[PDB]
Amino acid sequence: QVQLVESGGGVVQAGGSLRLSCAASGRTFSSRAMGWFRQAPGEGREFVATISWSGSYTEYADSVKGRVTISRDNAKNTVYLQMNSLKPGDTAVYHCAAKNGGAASNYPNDYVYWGQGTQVTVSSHHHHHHE
Amino acid sequence: VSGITALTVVVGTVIGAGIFFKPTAVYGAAGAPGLGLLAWFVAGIITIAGGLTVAEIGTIYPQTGGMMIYLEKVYGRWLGFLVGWAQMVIYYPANIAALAIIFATQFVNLFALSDSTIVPTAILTSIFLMGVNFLGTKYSGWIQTLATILKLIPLVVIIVAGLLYPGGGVIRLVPFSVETHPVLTSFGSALIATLFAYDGWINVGTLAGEMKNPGKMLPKVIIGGLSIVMAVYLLTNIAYLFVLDSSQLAGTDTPAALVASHLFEGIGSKLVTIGILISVFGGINGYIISGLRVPYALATQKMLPFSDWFARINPKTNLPINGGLVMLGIAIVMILTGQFNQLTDLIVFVIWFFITLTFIAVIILRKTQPDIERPYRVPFYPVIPLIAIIGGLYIIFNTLIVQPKNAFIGILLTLIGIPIYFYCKKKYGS
Ligand SMILES: [Zn+2]
């Protein structure tokens, strides 16, 4: 019942900025807490940020605090993740996740609905894109 | 509809394996049916008070973490961390440890076996449940729904039969305070034992945070639910004291088991004691579920020395198994060193040290930030949080002065995390 699509990923410069956004199926979004999680090519899930139903409570991990900000527009049924001063160590598929209830969570297993994820690549120099 | 459903959760999560085993320490310390039976009432009042006060801070910080975040947000990163270190090293492991011993104690009691095979069975049950949890939530959740259903059948069946026992009536609770077990010194050794049966009321924070627009009816559900538990715990104790008594209940480490074998002579007592082993098993399983969360939440910040390894969540199961492995091993240390009541008393003394900080925190917040959004506000504002703290202070002061050695293991293991905290705040993990 809760479909999620992430937008805003891509190739960035180190020290640059990026706004991930995740649209949700509506209906229940306003009564649900959301989370941003990330998955590096060589690993499992990593907690990034989470947010209360209302937005009153937010929480970010040690590796991203200060650099990133999570927000939501319950009217638009979207959750945003404003990343700034990026580092090559942010390079991961950023998934967006919804859980039941209005309390935030750093625990991935709480979350039941998961987005397919959006690729973010941070680098000081990159190779690809032909004609 | 909504309310009744939550009500169930309260009744459910609070009801544990405590009633089935703790009367041994309760009447063993009280030395009289009447003193013991009041400790079951006061603990319940203490936790309704503790519950309604914590729901306020739970609603100020809507999140599934609690005390790690309730205390960081008023006392600082250091106090927020200590509670985690305490939960990871003392509270989750000893709860696993105590219940695994008492499980095996009851296993040996039912299938009449040697009193040396308590500890090997306590290891294997805790080892088995850690494994089943690392398989996923398929099997853990299977155990939990089965445990929550069946844990209520022995109680109803004990209350009906016990309250109808032939040598039965008010007279079966007549010594109220015996002078051989002095009132004030013994009541604190009894309350610390009744409280372990009310364990799990603490999650009212995560419950209140989880409600959207709680207010009207969130306090009804906290009061109503915990007083249902309180009533059930008083009723089953009268049923016990109808069949056995003060000196008799303290005489077996398995009190409810004996009462079953009197109430129903045959295989009937087996079905009731089976039901009890399911209640204890489901406890250990449900503590592991909640256990894994803490070392990972620590690993989510700098807080733990191997934060990289601790925070690894296995992509097949979605759980940090590595956190629980350290917890399993330190539970094994505890199963091999302490006994079941030594451990129940640790757990109460230690977690209630931090639980109290969280009560004072609600009062602190009312002056720090009176303008912060409060979706729910503690009714009879000053009175009830102060009750919770009055009895909260009582338990910590009494266990120090009653059990200097057991209180020191709680003081010691919590403060061992202070060197750990300033190492991992500079190096960030490994
Ligand atoms: Zn190049």
Residue numbers in the entry:
A (entry chain B): 1 to 131
B (entry chain A): 4 to 433
From the paper:
The apo structure (without 2-AIB) was solved by molecular replacement and confirmed with data at 4.3 Å resolution from BasC (SeMet)-Nb74 crystals. The apo and holo structures are in an inward (cytoplasmic)-facing non-occluded conformation with TM1a and TM6b tilted to open a vestibule connecting the center of the transporter with the cytoplasm. By contrast, the central vestibule is not connected to the extracellular space. The BasC-Nb74 interaction interface is formed principally by the complementary determining regions 1 and 3 of the Nb and the BasC intracellular side of TM6b, 8, and 9 and intracellular loops 1 and 4, where mainly polar and electrostatic interactions are present. Nb74 recognizes residues from TM6b in bundle domain and TM8 and TM9 in hash domain, thereby pointing to a possible role of Nb74 in the inhibition of BasC activity. In the apo structure, the hydroxyl group of Tyr 236 is at H-bond distance from the backbone N of Gly 19 (TM1 unwound segment) and from the backbone O of Ala 200 (TM6a).
BasC crystallizes in complex with a nanobody (Nb), in a non-occluded inward-facing conformation in the apo state, and in complex with the substrate analog 2-aminoisobutyrate (2-AIB). BasC adopts the APC superfamily fold.
